[PDB]
Design a protein around this ligand. Structure first.
Ligand SMILES: Cc1cn([C@H]2C[C@H](O)[C@@H](COP(=O)(O)OP(=O)(O)[C@@H](C)P(=O)(O)O)O2)c(=O)[nH]c1=O
Ligand SMILES: [Cl-]
Ligand SMILES: [Cl-]
Ligand SMILES: [Cl-]
Ligand SMILES: [Mg+2]
Ligand code: NA
Ligand code: NA
Length: 326
DNA sequence: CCGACAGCGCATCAGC
DNA sequence: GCTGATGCGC
DNA sequence: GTCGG
């Protein structure tokens, strides 16, 4: 990509802050700057030039100058020389392993992919699966595969009940050419915002997808959220597709638009939009938009008929999913 | 010169 | 077992 | 780390 050098650096800095420092605002600052730069259709040649974009302040500006001049960051070289931090950065790439589990493992002398394999009994279920599929989960899903996955999931939910609506969100809905996981948003008139007539709903869908061996593994399971692992069927005599992460959300019909807004993101876009909502006197989550009080008490949910209704409330021009890719 | 920084679902852990 | 906190992930 | 007040 055009400014890939700069964006890789920022991302590497962001990972350090998330995985080691646990400084979540520095994480998002680097992450935000990285995304506005990656969207900038011009090759940044200086920090000063960069400083003109939003999210880019004084310190990223300086780091962009150092990187452009040397092809490196002293900060990043020292991190790379730090053995404990480096071990932590690697282990956190396994699904289910965050900074806390990474540090526990390192002190137990568990610091490599093979170390994990030799000590599987020290891993919880999520981490076992994260380890089992570690290679697969380093691989992105081509949009074309997302389409076949879409096709399977949308038909299966109709098979369990033709009144089900399944919407594929996340990066796919923003039009991305490849996606990290599959995010599926699900409704049914039986689950509405105040009375759930029939629970079990999410379980039936999961049950069917397991039955046809699309869903292969379970990470988490509740009334509104399933997290797991799925896989496209391969044709005769060929390499299986990689296993993929899937997240399915069951949301009331009356909350569908807040749900699809949330699940489409992106995460940086959601934080920006939600911050602006706060500054305009509202609060947005995946279910509702609510008025805010003088003392911060949340009011009752506002009527929502479309995604654009939510943008209107906080006085934003509607933005297509394709331009929410912050 | 500093405080704010989005919001939530589910699994596990610590202490009882 | 429960409460409440942490952990990890959308 | 950045941004707004
Ligand atoms: C992580 C996160 C997510 N989301 C919302 C918004 C977010 O879009 C949605 C899906 O989360 P994905 O982690 O799947 O993000 P994605 O856009 O699908 C993309 C990075 P890919 O999966 O192709 O790698 O959940 C948030 O609102 N806040 C968050 O912190
Ligand atoms: Cl921070
Ligand atoms: Cl470097
Ligand atoms: Cl709510
Ligand atoms: Mg996704
Ligand atoms: Na700026
Ligand atoms: Na991880």
């Amino acid at each position: 990509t055009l400014n890939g050098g700069i964006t890789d650096m920022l991302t590497e800095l962001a990972n350090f802050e998330k995985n080691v420092s646990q400084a979540i605002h520095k994480y998002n600052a680097y992450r935000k700057a990285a995304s506005v730069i990656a969207k900038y259709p011009h090759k940044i040649k200086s920090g000063a030039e960069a400083k003109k974009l939003p999210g880019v302040g004084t310190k990223i500006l300086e780091k962009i100058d150092e990187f452009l001049a040397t092809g490196k960051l002293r900060k990043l070289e020292k991190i790379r020389q730090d053995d404990t931090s480096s071990s932590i950065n690697f282990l956190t790439r396994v699904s289910g392993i965050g900074p806390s589990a990474a540090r526990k493992f390192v002190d137990e002398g568990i610091k490599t992919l093979e170390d994990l394999r030799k000590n599987e009994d020290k891993l919880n279920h999520h981490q076992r699966i994260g380890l089992k599929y570690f290679g697969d989960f380093e691989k992105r899903i081509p949009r074309e595969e997302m389409l076949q996955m879409q096709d399977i999931v949308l038909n299966e939910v109709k098979k369990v009940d033709s009144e089900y609506i399944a919407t594929v969100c996340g990066s796919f809905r923003r039009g991305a050419e490849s996606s990290g996981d599959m995010d599926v948003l699900l409704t049914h008139p039986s689950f509405t915002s105040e009375s759930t007539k029939q629970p079990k709903l999410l379980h039936q869908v999961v049950e069917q997808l397991q039955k046809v061996h699309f869903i292969t593994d379970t990470l988490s399971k509740g009334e509104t959220k399933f997290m797991g692992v799925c896989q496209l069927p391969s044709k005769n005599d060929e390499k299986e597709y990689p296993h993929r992460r899937i997240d399915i959300r069951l949301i009331p019909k009356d909350q569908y638009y807040c749900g699809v807004l949330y699940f489409t993101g992106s995460d940086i876009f959601n934080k920006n939009m939600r911050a602006h909502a706060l500054e305009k006197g509202f609060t947005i989550n995946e279910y509702t938009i609510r008025p805010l009080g003088v003392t911060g008490v949340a009011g009752e949910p506002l009527p929502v008929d479309s995604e654009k209704d939510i943008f209107d409330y906080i006085q934003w021009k509607y933005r297509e999913p394709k331009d929410r890719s912050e």
